[PDB]
Amino acid sequence: AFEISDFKEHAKKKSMWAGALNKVTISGLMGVFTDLMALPIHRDHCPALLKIFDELIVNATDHERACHSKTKKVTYIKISFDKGVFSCENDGPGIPIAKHEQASLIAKRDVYVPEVASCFFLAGTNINKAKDCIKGGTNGVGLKLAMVHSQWAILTTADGAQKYVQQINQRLDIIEPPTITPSREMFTRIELMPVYQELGYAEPLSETEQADLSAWIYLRACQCAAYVGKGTTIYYNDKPCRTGSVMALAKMYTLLSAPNSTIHTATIKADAKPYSLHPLQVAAVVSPKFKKFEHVSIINGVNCVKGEHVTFLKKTINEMVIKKFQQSCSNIFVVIVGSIPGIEWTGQRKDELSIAENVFKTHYSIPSSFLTSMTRSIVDILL
Amino acid sequence: AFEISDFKEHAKKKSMWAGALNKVTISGLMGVFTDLMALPIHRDHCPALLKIFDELIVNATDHERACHSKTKKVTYIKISFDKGVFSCENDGPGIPIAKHEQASLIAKRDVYVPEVASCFFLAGTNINKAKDCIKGGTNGVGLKLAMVHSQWAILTTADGAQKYVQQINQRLDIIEPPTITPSREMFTRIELMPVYQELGYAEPLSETEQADLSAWIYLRACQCAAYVGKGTTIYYNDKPCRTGSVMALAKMYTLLSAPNSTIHTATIKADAKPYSLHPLQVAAVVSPKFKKFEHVSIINGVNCVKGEHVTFLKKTINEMVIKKFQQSCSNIFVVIVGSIPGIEWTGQRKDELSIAENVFKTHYSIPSSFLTSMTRSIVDILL
Numbered sequence: 001a002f003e004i005s006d007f008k009e010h011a012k013k014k015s016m017w018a019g020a021l022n023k024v025t026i027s028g029l030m031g032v033f034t035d036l037m038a039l040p041i042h043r044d045h046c047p048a049l050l051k052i053f054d055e056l057i058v059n060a061t062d063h064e065r066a067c068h069s070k071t072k073k074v075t076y077i078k079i080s081f082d083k084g085v086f087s088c089e090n091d092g093p094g095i096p097i098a099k100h101e102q103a104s105l106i107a108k109r110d111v112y113v114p115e116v117a118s119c120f121f122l123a124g125t126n127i128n129k130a131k132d133c134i135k136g137g138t139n140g141v142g143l144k145l146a147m148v149h150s151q152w153a154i155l156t157t158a159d160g161a162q163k164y165v166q167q168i169n170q171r172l173d174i175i176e177p178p179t180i181t182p183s184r185e186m187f188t189r190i191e192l193m194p195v196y197q198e199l200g201y202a203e204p205l206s207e208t209e210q211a212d213l214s215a216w217i218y219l220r221a222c223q224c225a226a227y228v229g230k231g232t233t234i235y236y237n238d239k240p241c242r243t244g245s246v247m248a249l250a251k252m253y254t255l256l257s258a259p260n261s262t263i264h265t266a267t268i269k270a271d272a273k274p275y276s277l278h279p280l281q282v283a284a285v286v287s288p289k290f291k292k293f294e295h296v297s298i299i300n301g302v303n304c305v306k307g308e309h310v311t312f313l314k315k316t317i318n319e320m321v322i323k324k325f326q327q328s329c330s331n332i333f334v335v336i337v338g339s340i341p342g343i344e345w346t347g348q349r350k351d352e353l354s355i356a357e358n359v360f361k362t363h364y365s366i367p368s369s370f371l372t373s374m375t376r377s378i379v380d381i382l383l
Numbered sequence: 384a385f386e387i388s389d390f391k392e393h394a395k396k397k398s399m400w401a402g403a404l405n406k407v408t409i410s411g412l413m414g415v416f417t418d419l420m421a422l423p424i425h426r427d428h429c430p431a432l433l434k435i436f437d438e439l440i441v442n443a444t445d446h447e448r449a450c451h452s453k454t455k456k457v458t459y460i461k462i463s464f465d466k467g468v469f470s471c472e473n474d475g476p477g478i479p480i481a482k483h484e485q486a487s488l489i490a491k492r493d494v495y496v497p498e499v500a501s502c503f504f505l506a507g508t509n510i511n512k513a514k515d516c517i518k519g520g521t522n523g524v525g526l527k528l529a530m531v532h533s534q535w536a537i538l539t540t541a542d543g544a545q546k547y548v549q550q551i552n553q554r555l556d557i558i559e560p561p562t563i564t565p566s567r568e569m570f571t572r573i574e575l576m577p578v579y580q581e582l583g584y585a586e587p588l589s590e591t592e593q594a595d596l597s598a599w600i601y602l603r604a605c606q607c608a609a610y611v612g613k614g615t616t617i618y619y620n621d622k623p624c625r626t627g628s629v630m631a632l633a634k635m636y637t638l639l640s641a642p643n644s645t646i647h648t649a650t651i652k653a654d655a656k657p658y659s660l661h662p663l664q665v666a667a668v669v670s671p672k673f674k675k676f677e678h679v680s681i682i683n684g685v686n687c688v689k690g691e692h693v694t695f696l697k698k699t700i701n702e703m704v705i706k707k708f709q710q711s712c713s714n715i716f717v718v719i720v721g722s723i724p725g726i727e728w729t730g731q732r733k734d735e736l737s738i739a740e741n742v743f744k745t746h747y748s749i750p751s752s753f754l755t756s757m758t759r760s761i762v763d764i765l766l
């Protein structure tokens with residue numbers, strides 16, 4: 001009756017890794033539709049499926065970030081979705097094409113670094129992460145979840161001297177030996193076909209499933225375009241995602257509900273390292289048409305739905321609004337994008353970040369001009 | 384640079400398993416203080432520490448529940464907290480005192496079932512859980528997290544014929560061989576000393592840390608008292624937790640803010656199995672003094688902060704309120720306690736449950752008398 005599972009079988013059965021493994025109601029689910037307009041998707045979807053995509057996307061946005069290591073130059077992240085096949089490719093240095101001595105002993109066969117990265121659970125370059133490292137990745141798990149939910153997958157990486165191609169098939173059951181050839185290219189690509197039918201979807205995807213998933217991925221790519229460094233262009237199905245600022249994100253999310261609106265902007269800064277290395281970009285819209293407070297937070301490349309950084313903004317605005325009114329956040333839509341050192345995620349899904357609220361009180365300052373303009377707009381509505 | 388971790392080392396370093404491993408701001412943190420009054424704890428605390436306690440408590444509440452197995456009779460759950468030492472004991476059948484053949488081969492030594500339960504990750508009786516099983520436990524992880532965050536721990540279990548005592552020390556590094564003796568007792572006890580200092584606390588606990596943690600545990604025990612079956616009494620430091628109904632919970636949470644209030648009650652039922660086996664108990668208070676909607680949900684023994692069961696209640700009330708007003712949830716405090724089959728938790732912490740919203744629409748009915756009285760109270764406030 002007491003059973004012992006391995007990681008691979010556990011991940012196919014257990015919602016704890018990536019969320020539910022069939023379709024459920026995902027409150028707040030959005031996608032982008034073509035001007036770009038973010039719109040709700042009021043149909044049930046599988047959280048673990050969307051997480052396949054997210055794990056690959058955050059791995060790509062992580063790559064340009066140095067954590068006490070040599071700088072890496074990434075000029076593109078290319079995301080593709082067609083005929084059910086999903087791929088994500090970025091340049092910058094490839095995953096090292098070299099034998100991993102420890103994994104080879106554990107496996108009793110030659111195992112190269114990219115196979116460790118994609119096939120070994122609890123394995124990666126962030127196992128001993130510094131508290132100030134602002135990569136989203138931390139557990140050495142996410143890429144393996146993508147593989148375990150794929151009927152077939154191909155990892156291709158090149159390092160400027162060699163290219164490494166490896167098939168990882170049947171939900172990680174069948175790892176084929178890699179093919180290594182000479183090459184002058186340099187990139188990392190993951191291409192896969194999710195187990196759609198096992199996750200509740202039609203085989204092949206229905207028209208509506210395809211449209212919803214494409215819209216979700218496109219919006220995730222647009223979020224990345226605002227987060228990544230100035231040198232990186234994001235593409236979705238070869239089209240550049242032209243949402244490189246928090247203002248552009250705010251406009252896309254409010255185009256239906258409050259077109260031609262004022263966008264209040266702020267760069268929230270800190271004086272002391274490590275916080276001073278990481279300004280937070282903010283854009284907000286205030287409208288009486290908004291039914292409840294909403295934020296979109298892209299923190300360390302992750303779409304965060306809950307965290308004390310939001311509360312810091314809301315409480316600071318509220319204090320001012322109460323004062324000005326006496327002479328409060330339900331009319332606000334706010335976008336917050338940037339890196340925060342020292343946060344801890346509450347699960348592999350990275351839905352919620354955890355931190356002492358006093359980090360923001362001690363270290364960060366919200367510009368008075370933004371607070372004053374937000375307060376004026378909110379009070380006008382209240383009155 | 385690419386490192387491979389084992390589960391034990393990963394759990395000591397990674398917030399994904401139990402939450403942050405030092406003190407952070409936990410919005411909504413509450414404890415009970417002595418009449419019983421639930422009050423906020425406005426000090427940062429370590430989520431993983433509180434999760435040690437929760438994992439043991441949910442294991443105890445799970446024990447009486449049959450999932451297509453023989454019925455188990457549990458008459459008590461005794462929780463203790465003194466001098467930093469935490470223990471949880473329940474009766475009912477003990478963990479089997481028998482050699483585990485598979486674990487013994489993996490370990491190359493004699494390993495008994497209770498050592499598998501407490502020391503092997505991804506191991507337990509719920510690995511192949513039926514979708515209709517309403518135990519909180521699912522992953523085969525929680526007890527190991529308790530051990531990995533203990534400087535010392537003792538597992539004691541008895542099966543009516545033998546007693547098994549095993550020391551599990553130094554954050555799972557040092558598993559001592561068990562001592563097995565004849566016995567007529569029958570129970571399962573876990574006693575441990577958390578690694579307080581490593582988790583941010585004083586050694587020994589400060590007066591305030593001790594008071595906060597005791598209050599948190601006591602409130603968690605009171606929540607259990609409303610969830611468990613009629614035959615089980617919950618004790619905290621030997622005192623019975625006299626909060627056996629949702630009404631008693633609602634009163635304790637509103638005693639400071641709205642004493643002597645009306646408590647609206649409902650039992651939400653479904654007609655079809657498996658849902659019809661699991662009525663949901665509800666108690667709500669409506670007051671203009673409440674600043675925002677709040678719920679306390681004990682679902683499958685777990686304190687759930689987010690789930691579509693709440694949304695089902697809010698939307699049903701809102702529809703009525705809009706209609707009656709025209710001739711809405713911020714004045715509500717609501718307690719919901721019961722089992723829901725087919726939910727999936729989003730992480731090991733079980734903060735959020737996932738389900739299709741249509742489960743409630745199709746299967747469950749909220750009594751009209753409760754909806755009507757709630758609506759009258761809410762509309763009176765609006766007007």
Ligand SMILES: Nc1ncnc2c1ncn2[C@@H]1O[C@H](COP(=O)(O)OP(=O)(O)NP(=O)(O)O)[C@@H](O)[C@H]1O
Nearest residue numbers: 059060117124125126137138139140141142143188
């Ligand atoms: N697109 C990529 N480009 C370059 N290196 C990559 C890429 N994707 C993954 N890697 C490497 O492969 C490792 C394993 O990835 P992954 O399993 O996602 O773990 P992680 O990103 O470190 N942590 P997490 O995603 O929180 O589980 C990473 O640590 C990187 O070193």
Ligand SMILES: Nc1ncnc2c1ncn2[C@@H]1O[C@H](COP(=O)(O)OP(=O)(O)NP(=O)(O)O)[C@@H](O)[C@H]1O
Nearest residue numbers: 442443500507508509520521522523524525526571
């Ligand atoms: N108090 C207890 N009384 C009896 N059996 C217990 C008790 N605690 C744990 N067990 C058994 O030990 C197993 C391992 O517990 P645990 O590691 O918490 O896993 P789980 O409860 O099945 N799943 P999860 O808590 O979601 O990780 C359980 O499946 C039970 O069979």
Ligand SMILES: [Mg+2]
Nearest residue numbers: 059137142143
């Ligand atoms: Mg990753």
Ligand SMILES: [Mg+2]
Nearest residue numbers: 442520525526
């Ligand atoms: Mg458990």
